C-alpha cells in the first residue's frame, strides 16, 4: 500500500551565519561605497547605513 512503499529522503541541515560563510547563493557582488548612506548586503545581512 501507500504506507509501505519505500521512500528516499535527503535531509539538508544548514548552519546559520555566525562565521565566514563558505556556502552562498547565486548572487553577484558589487563595488564598495564608503562614507555615504547606502543600502548594504554583507553575506545575507541586509541593512541601511553609512
Amino acid at each position: 500500500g501507500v504506507g509501505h512503499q519505500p521512500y528516499r529522503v535527503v535531509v539538508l541541515s544548514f548552519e546559520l551565519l555566525h562565521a565566514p560563510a563558505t556556502v552562498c547563493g547565486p548572487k553577484k557582488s558589487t563595488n564598495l561605497v564608503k562614507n555615504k548612506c547606502v543600502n548594504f548586503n554583507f553575506n545575507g545581512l541586509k541593512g541601511t547605513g553609512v
Binding site: 500500500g1 501507500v2 504506507g3 509501505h4
Partner: protein, 49 residues
Amino acid sequence: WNRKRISNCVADYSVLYNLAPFFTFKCYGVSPTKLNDLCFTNVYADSFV
C-alpha cells in the same frame, strides 16, 4: 455508521502502524505522538467507507 465503545483496556497506538498502510492520520487537540502518555475515560471509534 458504526460506533464502537472502547473502554477498560490499555491502548497502545503504535500497533495501529502495523494494522494498515495509512493514507491520512491527522488529529485535533492532541498530538499523535503523545497519545501513549495520556488517559481517557472512554474512546469511540466510528467506521465507514
